[PDB]
Amino acid sequence: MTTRMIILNGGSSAGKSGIVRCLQSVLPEPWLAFGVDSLIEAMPLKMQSAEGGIEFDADGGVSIGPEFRALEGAWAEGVVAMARAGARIIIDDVFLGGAAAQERWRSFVGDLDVLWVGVRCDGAVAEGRETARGDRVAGMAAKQAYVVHEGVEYDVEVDTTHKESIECAWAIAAHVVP
Amino acid sequence: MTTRMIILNGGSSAGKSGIVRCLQSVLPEPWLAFGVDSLIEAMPLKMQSAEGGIEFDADGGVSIGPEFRALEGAWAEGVVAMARAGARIIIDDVFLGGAAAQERWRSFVGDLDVLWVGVRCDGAVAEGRETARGDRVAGMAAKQAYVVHEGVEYDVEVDTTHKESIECAWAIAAHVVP
Amino acid sequence: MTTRMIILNGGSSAGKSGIVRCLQSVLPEPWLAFGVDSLIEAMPLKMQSAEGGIEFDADGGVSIGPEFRALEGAWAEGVVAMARAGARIIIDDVFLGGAAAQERWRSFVGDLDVLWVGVRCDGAVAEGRETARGDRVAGMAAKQAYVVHEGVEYDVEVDTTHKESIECAWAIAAHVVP
Amino acid sequence: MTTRMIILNGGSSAGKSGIVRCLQSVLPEPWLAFGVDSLIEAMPLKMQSAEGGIEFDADGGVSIGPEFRALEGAWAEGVVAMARAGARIIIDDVFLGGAAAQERWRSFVGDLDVLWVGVRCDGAVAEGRETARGDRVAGMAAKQAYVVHEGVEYDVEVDTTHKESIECAWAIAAHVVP
Numbered sequence A, B, C, D: 001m002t003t004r005m006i007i008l009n010g011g012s013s014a015g016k017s018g019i020v021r022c023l024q025s026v027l028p029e030p031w032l033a034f035g036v037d038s039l040i041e042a043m044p045l046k047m048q049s050a051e052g053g054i055e056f057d058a059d060g061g062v063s064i065g066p067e068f069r070a071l072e073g074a075w076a077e078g079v080v081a082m083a084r085a086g087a088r089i090i091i092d093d094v095f096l097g098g099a100a101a102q103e104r105w106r107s108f109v110g111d112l113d114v115l116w117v118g119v120r121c122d123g124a125v126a127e128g129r130e131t132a133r134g135d136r137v138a139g140m141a142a143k144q145a146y147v148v149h150e151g152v153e154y155d156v157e158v159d160t161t162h163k164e165s166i167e168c169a170w171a172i173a174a175h176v177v178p
């Protein structure tokens, strides 16, 4: 019944991190937030230049090797263990592998009560926000806007194309069982 | 005729910096961007704890003393001199003093060809974005959403309540004379 | 035998994060880094204004309430679970409670093979670096420089007062069993 | 007599920005700080991918084109105009062209009272700090450690190899005429 973990999936610039910060403010109990950004931040800088690490193409493409996966996997078991220990966890990720990525997460969460959230946004709109964010490599938002949702099953879906982050946070918070 | 400087005015979280980065991307010639954020960044950290410096109240209020003004004034003459020297300058500021703030800027720009831009956004919407930005002191967006525009005259007005940053950038870019 | 986790303890501005980034570069296998900075970053922003959250005094003091501890505890079990799952973890923390803080960590790591590292630095020198870092609240470095080491037991001790981060990283890396 | 502007020159990771923040804290009057970092930040992001913009090689090399120079030049006249208007300015730059770079600055400052500061640091030590800073492209520090000082004339020279930033700030502050 009680929601232990909230997992958001959406393309780059779809507005996930904004929604996450809104949720942390809205939800009464303290929720810990981790995601693709914090993981990469925690990983050695050289992982971004490594063999089977992660590589960001100049056109917005992304390649993930086994070195990166091995770590991410251990990290996933860790966040789940945190939830199991009583910490409310919010995870924002990018399911590059679509359904396969969701399945990978399912293998780690087991029977933990999870709230699966989909964060959609028009490709062209996301691209604009990517440019607005100033520093982002161009091309990622457009490339990930749709494929990351293929075959993915959600409990709640929000679309930031015409809805503010705080509004999507309200919609999501309503599906969180205390 | 040729636009030398673009000055944007709007409350906190109205979306100015996003628009500025979009303009830098859109406009063909290179535009240098400076604003309230970069100025404070350039000022001594102690200016934020000083006598007649700048003080951010816990409720989102802002107080500016003479020490801060003295510097800002010299800085303003500097950015104008940059434009005079041929650098295309974009300035994003918050006219806390309404018309008075615009008048102060006018005293510095002289007959320089300037494009005055107003960036409006619904107070409640701006507040939401403030929360989404995660780290912002709560209360500033609501407090500045309307008063900073009182008596201010613009050449172009954009409203980010229902328009993306890139879209507002297109509207503004159309009024920029090459 | 094989080192699974490296735990660094030292006062603010002692140079922990610099050493951690050097270790991630030096050590051949990928090491995940988490610490006080990333935890606070992951915690709701409101935790910094909460009842039994964390509070940074204007003079550099720090108060931790039960709300903060509850989360930190679950988080600690999580990073340990990550190590247990095969991820090499580096943790940089500030043992405000001295030996008590180390004991708390011991209760979580169990028999996991851990490398306890002490990072010392002259109080006045740390204070200077605090000022140099530009944005840091003044007073923290001096306050934490010595008490955080009282009764704490280390496997390796490095002193950054006259040694570069990369040098301390070499000293620490030599005690890491592959 | 009265010092109007302080210009620091040194290779990447030599510790310039740390010294600058120490100076802003130490010096009694408020000093505005601008440098290579703030300029690039103010320039369009695309300047880093442009024809005659700025390009950072993967090995730490740096190439500056005419597009970048044109802007920098106008910007230089601007900071000088700020000083002329009464704002105390601190500039931290990297004289890639050695004496030629200092000459370029001289053409802009005219007879303005300037304090020329040299910030040296052992190449290998700077490289280590580069790694410690975590995110810096490797190779820049070593490449710039010595050539940027060739034929450059200073009023004060500080060496951060064995001196803290705050200490170098004290040495520099002593040559600042009120």
Ligand SMILES: Nc1ncnc2c1ncn2[C@@H]1O[C@H](COP(=O)(O)OP(=O)(O)OP(=O)(O)O)[C@@H](O)[C@H]1O
Pocket (backbone or CB within 6 Å): A010, A011, A012, A013, A014, A015, A016, A017, A018, A019, A036, A037, A094, A129, A130, A132, A133, A160, A161, A163, A164, A165
């Ligand atoms: N609902 C929204 N309406 C308009 N702009 C938004 C909205 N949500 C977020 N933004 C803006 O979009 C930009 C990018 O969004 P954000 O960083 O939240 O995306 P993200 O999905 O977290 O990105 P990534 O997947 O790369 O980590 C930011 O500048 C953010 O402020």
Ligand SMILES: Nc1ncnc2c1ncn2[C@@H]1O[C@H](COP(=O)(O)OP(=O)(O)OP(=O)(O)O)[C@@H](O)[C@H]1O
Pocket (backbone or CB within 6 Å): B010, B011, B012, B013, B014, B015, B016, B017, B018, B019, B036, B037, B094, B129, B130, B132, B133, B160, B161, B163, B164, B165
């Ligand atoms: N048109 C928009 N639609 C939705 N979200 C937007 C829009 N423009 C900007 N945002 C988001 O609003 C937040 C705050 O906006 P931004 O930082 O651009 O405001 P600002 O006016 O520059 O703030 P300040 O005055 O404090 O410097 C950011 O998270 C940004 O991504």
Ligand SMILES: Nc1ncnc2c1ncn2[C@@H]1O[C@H](COP(=O)(O)OP(=O)(O)OP(=O)(O)O)[C@@H](O)[C@H]1O
Pocket (backbone or CB within 6 Å): C010, C011, C012, C013, C014, C015, C016, C017, C018, C019, C036, C037, C094, C129, C130, C132, C133, C160, C161, C163, C164, C165
């Ligand atoms: N060995 C060193 N010699 C000189 N300066 C150093 C050294 N190690 C780190 N520094 C500098 O000291 C400053 C503060 O150090 P750092 O941020 O690494 O400390 P920290 O212990 O991680 O801080 P906190 O506990 O607040 O997280 C930084 O500006 C850093 O570059």
Ligand SMILES: Nc1ncnc2c1ncn2[C@@H]1O[C@H](COP(=O)(O)OP(=O)(O)OP(=O)(O)O)[C@@H](O)[C@H]1O
Pocket (backbone or CB within 6 Å): D010, D011, D012, D013, D014, D015, D016, D017, D018, D019, D036, D037, D094, D129, D130, D132, D133, D160, D161, D163, D164, D165
């Ligand atoms: N005197 C010092 N002793 C030890 N570490 C130092 C000293 N001064 C600075 N550092 C550290 O060296 C690193 C790099 O220095 P810093 O960023 O100040 O260099 P910089 O010359 O400003 O770089 P750039 O030219 O790329 O802008 C930082 O992590 C900083 O904390």
Ligand SMILES: [Mg+2]
Pocket (backbone or CB within 6 Å): A016, A017, A035, A037, A092
């Ligand atoms: Mg995100």
Ligand SMILES: [Mg+2]
Pocket (backbone or CB within 6 Å): B016, B017, B035, B037, B092
């Ligand atoms: Mg702004």
Ligand SMILES: [Mg+2]
Pocket (backbone or CB within 6 Å): C016, C017, C035, C037, C092
């Ligand atoms: Mg640290």
Ligand SMILES: [Mg+2]
Pocket (backbone or CB within 6 Å): D016, D017, D035, D037, D092
């Ligand atoms: Mg610098």
